Amino acid sequence: EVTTSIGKRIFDHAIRYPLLKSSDKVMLKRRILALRRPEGQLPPIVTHNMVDDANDLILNKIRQVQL
Amino acid sequence: SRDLQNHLLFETATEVANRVGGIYSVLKSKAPITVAQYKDHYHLIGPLNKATYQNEVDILDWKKPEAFSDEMRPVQHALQTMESRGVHFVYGRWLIEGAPKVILFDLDSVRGYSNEWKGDLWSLVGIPSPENDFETNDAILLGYTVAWFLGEVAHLDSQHAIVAHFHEWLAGVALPLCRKRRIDVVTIFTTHATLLGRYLCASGSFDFYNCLESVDVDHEAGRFGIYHRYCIERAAAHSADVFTTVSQITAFEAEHLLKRKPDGILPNGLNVIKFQQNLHALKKEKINDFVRGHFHGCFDFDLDNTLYFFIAGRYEYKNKGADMFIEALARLNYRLKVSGSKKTVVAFIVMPAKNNSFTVEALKGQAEVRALENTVHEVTTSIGKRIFDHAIRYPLLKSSDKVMLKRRILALRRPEGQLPPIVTHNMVDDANDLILNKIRQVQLFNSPSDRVKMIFHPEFLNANNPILGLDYDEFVRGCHLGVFPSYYEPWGYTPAECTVMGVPSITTNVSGFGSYMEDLIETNQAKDYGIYIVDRRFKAPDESVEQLVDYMEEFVKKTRRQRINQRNATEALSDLLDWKRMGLEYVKARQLALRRGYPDQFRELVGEELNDSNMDALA
Amino acid sequence: EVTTSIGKRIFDHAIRYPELLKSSDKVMLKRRILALRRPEGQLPPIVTHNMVDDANDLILNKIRQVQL
Amino acid sequence: QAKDYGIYIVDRRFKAPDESVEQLVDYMEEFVKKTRRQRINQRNATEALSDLLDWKRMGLEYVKARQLALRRGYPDQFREL
Ligand SMILES: O=c1ccn([C@@H]2O[C@H](COP(=O)(O)OP(=O)(O)O)[C@@H](O)[C@H]2O)c(=O)[nH]1
């Protein structure tokens, strides 16, 4: 959204002769905050909730080899 | 010599920088209009929600001298004081369209004073209330802190006069305080619904809008446990110079239930340009796609000649009037059989419920169709090449193709006298859920004799729904008619945003929105502007129901070109609803406060004496 | 346009259970083919353009002189 | 009603050569001065007038011309029918 806005502003200037608005910064800065990692929290090794997590063979191996 | 012209604003409620209700929106959508008027002299104030606040707020260091101008220095110093005394607060911009500056009061950093304060309060009124009220404690801690902040601002500032606006009882403690301390600020109070009003239509039943002149003064607040709270609300309403509500209908409760005719009305705007290729024709097709795989196996009708009706939002079964909708609907089916009509209505219900995600039965549908689609598409671009090639050389269905088509069709069969469902989900409490129960009773089971089909999707829509692949704003543009026949609805953003999206909607004169709209359009031109207002105040409940059914029949029985000219008029109405116009009504109320508080300073400014007894009166 | 009808037609049949080239289409196709016939034993050209000195232009005379 | 449904009929039979020109300039000037709403409506009125230009209605005159021609060639023959 922010970039096709830049697009129009740029192209328009060019077409009349002879970039980031505030509104934009406000929303980008929000999208970034939205993305923060909950403090020493690590990228998961599963993508699902495991019915029998503590026993599942694969997670157990991954845990042991410490990745 | 406090300045009336170049003056300052402080807006407070509990929903600043943290969603809790709909006020978070109102204040938010309002932002950029109000920030344009005031720039750095506008400040939202509210209690800090230590969880959400960091995603919501750009945290700022107010201590730097650049953090306020020389003119606004006083607030800096009010804050200096405010930290000195061990109150802590977050200062910064709210991260929303408008970037309005905000003050967030750590209520923990003052729970110390709690006892002296919870004390000073009923001893400024009556008798205290159980510690079983995390709500009012916060309400109070907040009020006292805010009052305290205003005192200091009025103490240190003398350039500008200060308007302090307050939304809803929870942020209304600060108000008695300001009268009873007689501090040099002018106060406005907006209720977004009465507290007494919510409880009375809770379970039941009192011809609410009818027998409320005739309602027990206090005892009624007493029996509901709401008594200490009513008193804050009542206390709040009376202390402010200006008393307001959001809709004409809400000012009828306000007057009788809190005993003060509101000096006006602040109806909720939207920023229209946040809503405004043919969209309708295109989103309709994404709906179509779900209707196809939902009615798979038994598809007896023309989607070319099918109308989409929807009701949507928080699952208030009777206030939202979902009762009348499912009812008006069964009746509409009746009428439509008799007149042997060829049209078909699929009605949607988008109210969230306790669920276990999508019925297997439903995911097979939107799988097998996505499947048939691919095959049909594969078979046809094959035909394409074979045809074009023949043509290009001068001077259709292969076997391989038939084999696979015939499979896709078998895949789609209906499990023998099995009927298209009325839900799309597995319902946690199916046999009790109010909506299914109604649909069952009026016997709409999507029988192929039925001209009205019912579908209930007990989840807010999200775009990557595997079944109904739309954002709700897409789903709306997609439909034909929105039906929101409410009982209790102080404003009701749904019908509003629905209208703004250029979709015709049925509303009711007991709906905040509906009331405002009735009192806007000249009665008859309503229907043709694509707003149907259904009277649910002066008619017999059964009379109303029959009026909703009338409006429905009218809509069905309409030529494509008619429908269009209506839609067009509802787009044209969208401009009436933008903040730019509803925002003047806030300026009317503040200017009231600025007068009533500084009358001679006022009469000196305008050069003459104007009427103060009511908002519009003064303009 | 012809084939995406054929699509719609097949897909509608299928979802509706229990020469698909409708002769409106059959016509417009019969037409766009005729539009392609090469005017009596004339050959696909060896230039795309209305050359000026058509006759004395070197690249051409050599194509003709090798009868391509 | 012509103006609303999209047809400006400039008078060029009666009026001057020149007084027609000022009437063309009128209709144009009139049209420019519409806001972008008034316009979208006008276009909606126009498209609606399409239904009166269809052969599916206009043809009925060709249907008459043919009938009259029969009547006329076989007058009493026709009278029976
Ligand atoms: O799939 C949906 C359905 C509804 N809504 C929103 O739910 C909110 C509730 O509407 P309203 O403010 O009128 O309150 P309600 O009528 O739900 O009590 C509205 O803003 C809708 O835009 C949504 O975001 N997604």
Q: Is the CB of B461 under 6 A from ligand 1?
A: yes
Q: Supply B319's token pair.
A: 């206030």
Cα-based distances in Å from B456 to B97, B123, B313, B355, B436 = 34, 52, 12, 12, 8
- In total, chain A counts a number of residues equal to 67
Q: CA distances (Å), B608 to each of B70, B99, B157, B333, in order?
A: 33, 37, 27, 63
Q: Is D48 on the interface with B (CB under 8 A)?
A: yes
DSSP string computed for B206-269: S-TTTSSTTS-TTHHHHHTT-HHHHHHHHHHHHHSSEEEESSHHHHHHHHHHHT---SEE-PPP
Place of tokens 């200037």: A13
Terminal Cα-to-Cα distance of chain B (whole angstroms): 24
Backbone φ, ψ for residue B481 (5° rounding): -140, 125
Coil, helix or strand at residue B544: helix
Tally Cβ neighbours within 10 Å of residue B166: 29
CA B209 centroid distance within chain: 21
CB-based contacts of D46, cutoff 8 Å, min separation 6: D5, D6, D7
Distance CA B152, CA B396 (A): 86
Same domain as B130, residue B240:
yes
* B260 Cα–ligand 1 center, Å: 30
Answer yes or no: do B389 and B490 share one domain.
no
Map residue A45 onto helix, strand or coil: coil
Q: Pick the residue of B276, B565, B570, B576 with the most D CBs within 10 A to test the interface with D by mutation.
A: B565
Q: Which chains touch D (3 or more CB pairs under 8 A)?
A: B
D39 annotated binding-site participant: yes
Do B285 and B340 share a domain, yes or no? yes
Residues in chain D: 81
Q: Do B280 and B368 lie in a common domain?
A: no
Contact residues on chain C for B380, CB-CB shorter than 8 A: 3-4, 6-7, 10
| Integer Cα distance of D30 and B397 in angstroms | 58
- Residue B350, ligand 1, Cβ within 6 A: yes
DSSP reduced 3-state for B349: strand
**Nearest CA, atom 22, ligand 1:** B494
Asked if A21 has any chain B CB less than 8 Å from its own CB, the reply is: no
State whether B376 and C32 contact (CB < 8 Å): no
Determine contact: C60 vs chain B, CB below 8 A: no
Instruction: Evaluate whether B227 touches B216 at the Cβ level (below 8 Å).
Output: no
Contacts with B81 (C-beta within 8 Å, 6 or more apart), sequence order? B152
Chain C neighbors of B292, CB-CB under 8 A: 15
CA dihedral B191, B196, B198, B202 (to 10 degrees): 180
Q: Which domain holds residue B394?
A: 357-432
From the CA of B497, how far away is ligand 1's center (Å)?
9
CB B517 within 8 A of CB B322: no
What is d(CA D9, CA D1) in angstroms, rounded to the nearest whole number?
Answer: 11
* Amino acid, single-letter form, for residue B317: Y
- Distance (Å, rounded) from C-alpha B208 to C-alpha B247? 16
Output the CA angle B384-B388-B389, nearest 5 degrees.
115
Nearest to B572 among D37, D44, D48 (CB): D37
Against chain A, the chains showing at least 3 CB pairs within 8 Å are B
Residue B585, helix vs strand vs coil: helix
Query: Cα-flanking dihedrals φ and ψ of residue B209, to 5°?
Result: -65, 5
Q: Which pair of structure tokens corresponds to residue B365?
A: 């549908």
- Measured between beta carbons, which residues in chain C are less than 8 angstroms from residue B382? none
C7 and B380 within 8 Å at the Cβ level: the answer is yes
Q: What tokens appear for B424 in the block?
A: 């799309």
DSSP code of residue A18: -
Residue of B17, B83, B73, B1 whose CA lies nearest to B41 = B73
Tell me the CA–centroid distance for residue B314 and ligand 1, in Å: 6
Show the tokens assigned to B251: 């000012």
- Sign of the C-alpha dihedral computed for residues B527, B532, B538 and B541 taken in this order: positive
Give the pair of three-digit tokens for residue B184. Answer: 């040099």
Contact assignment for B391 to C36 by CB distance below 8 Å: yes
CA of B28 to the centre of ligand 1 (A): 15
Give the H or E element holding residue B451.
Answer: none
Q: Which residues of B302-322 are buried (b: 16+ CB within 10 A; e: fewer)?
A: ebeebbbbbbbbebebbbbbb
Q: B379, B413, B432 — which closes off a domain?
A: B432
Query: What is the Cα–Cα distance from B65 to B69, expressed in whole angstroms?
Result: 8
* Residue B480 assigned as binding residue: yes
Is A33 within 8 Å of B54 (Cβ atoms)? yes
Sheet containing B42-47: give its strands across. B57-59, B89-94, B101-105, B42-47, B3-12, B160-167, B186-191, B242-245, B264-265
User: Is B605 found in the same domain as B553?
Assistant: no
From B472, B477, B489, B491, the mutation candidate for ligand 1 (largest count of ligand atoms within 8 A of CB) is B472
Number of compact structural domains in chain B? 3
Q: Is C45 exposed, middle or buried (0-12, 13-18, 19+ CB in 10 A)?
A: exposed
| Contacts across the B-C interface (CB distance below 8 Å) | 47
**Residue among C8, C13, C16 at smallest CA distance from B285:** C8
Indicate whether B555 and B572 sit together in one domain: yes
**Is B408 within any annotated ligand binding site?**
no
Tokens 């600025």 sit at which residue?
B594
Pairing of strands B425-427, B355-358: antiparallel
Domain boundary among B389, B414, B432: B432
CA distance C63 to C60: 5
Q: Which residues contact A2 (CB under 8 A, 6 or more apart)?
A: A20, A24, A27, A28
Closest of B374, B366, B363, B368 to residue B401, by C-alpha: B374
B576 burial (CB, 10 Å; 0-12 / 13-18 / 19+) is middle
B474 CB less than 6 Å from ligand 1?
no
Distance between CA atoms of residues B388 and B393, nearest Å: 9
Shared-domain flag, residues B450 and B409: no
In angstroms, the CA A60 to CA B12 distance is 53
Contact C32 B377 (CB under 8 A): no
Distance from CA of B495 to the nearest CA of C (A): 35
Domain boundary pick from B398, B432, B466: B432
Q: Nearest to residue B458, comparing CAs of B493, B497, B428? A: B428
Give nearest CA residue, ligand 1 atom 11.
B493
Residues near B370 by beta carbon (within 8 Å), at least 6 away in sequence = B293
What is the distance in A from the centroid of ligand 1 to the CA of B494?
A: 6
B369 and B334 within one domain: no
Residue B561 to residue D41, Cβ atoms within 8 A: no
Sheet holding B505-508, edge to edge: B452-456, B344-350, B306-312, B481-483, B505-508, B531-534
How many Cα atoms are found within 13 Å in the side-chain-facing hemisphere of B241?
A: 25
3-state secondary structure of A35: coil
Cα within 13 Å of Cα(B576), Cβ side: 17
CB D44 to CB B572 under 8 A? no
Which amino acid, B170? L
Q: A with B: how many residue pairs have Cβ under 8 Å apart?
A: 18
The token pair that represents D45 in the structure block:
């009125």
Hey, which residues does B59 pair with through a beta bridge? B92
HEC string of D20-68 equals HHHHHHHHHHHHHCCCHHHHHHHHHHHHHHHHHCCHHHHCHHHHHHHHH
Token couple for B619:
């303009």
Do B136 and B247 sit in the same domain of this protein?
yes
How far, CA to CA in Å, does B365 sit from each of B291, B321, C9? 9, 30, 20
> Are residues B388 and B287 located together in one domain of the fold?
no
The C-alpha angle B220, B223, B225, rounded to 5 degrees, equals 110
Integer CA distances (angstroms), C63 to A61, B416, B557, C46, C50, in order: 73, 74, 72, 8, 16
- CA distance, residue B35 to nearest chain D CA (Å): 30
**Does one domain contain both B605 and B524?**
no
